């Protein structure tokens, strides 16, 4: 259809937690969604010679009652990341807001610095509206997201391994 459908199979503490299925707002933020979709299928090659892929990447920062962050496919700690458009790409638009849990939004390091890192909201995050591009939402597997929330801490550090064991487009 108009909007792409992608998924993450999540492993927590080396144990399958289930699948998260996302609906990408391809009709509102095409460039942003295409980047995420391509990173789920691993169809593009990065600047390091490896194909950009969320498979086996981890959720390095989870803060209960805030959000789950991942996508650092280069360093796995937040300092890295890479998009199919290069180290970073411009903010498409901020039409969609973080008005509810289960939203897929781009993490960044200030204006126009989107790469591969993203976060899934656990509550409404109004203070991020206009600063982070919301490009999708969870349509199935919110229980898995809640399972991940359980692994976070106020510091954000994730004591037990939260990994994406598989991913792709549906």
């Amino acid at each position: 259809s108009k909007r792409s459908k992608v998924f993450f199979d999540i492993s927590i503490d080396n144990s399958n937690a289930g699948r998260i299925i996302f609906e990408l707002f391809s009709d509102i933020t095409p460039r942003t969604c295409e980047n995420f979709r391509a990173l789920c299928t691993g169809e593009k090659i990065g600047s390091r010679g490896k194909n950009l892929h969320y498979k086996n990447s981890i959720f390095h920062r989870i803060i209960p009652q805030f959000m789950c962050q991942g996508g650092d496919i280069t360093n796995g700690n937040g300092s890295g990341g890479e998009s199919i458009y290069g180290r970073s790409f411009t903010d498409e638009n901020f039409n969609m807001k973080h008005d509810q849990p289960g939203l897929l939004s781009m993490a960044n390091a200030g204006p126009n610095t989107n790469s591969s890192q993203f976060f899934i909201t656990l509550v409404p995050c109004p203070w991020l509206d206009g600063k982070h591009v919301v490009f999708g939402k969870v349509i199935e597997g919110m229980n898995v997201v809640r399972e991940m929330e359980k692994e976070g801490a106020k510091s954000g550090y994730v004591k037990r391994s939260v990994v994406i064991t598989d991913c792709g487009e549906l």
Partner: peptide, 11 residues
Amino acid sequence: XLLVTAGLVLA
């Protein structure tokens, strides 16, 4: 505080 950044995470 509560932000989602890539590299210098602040309060």
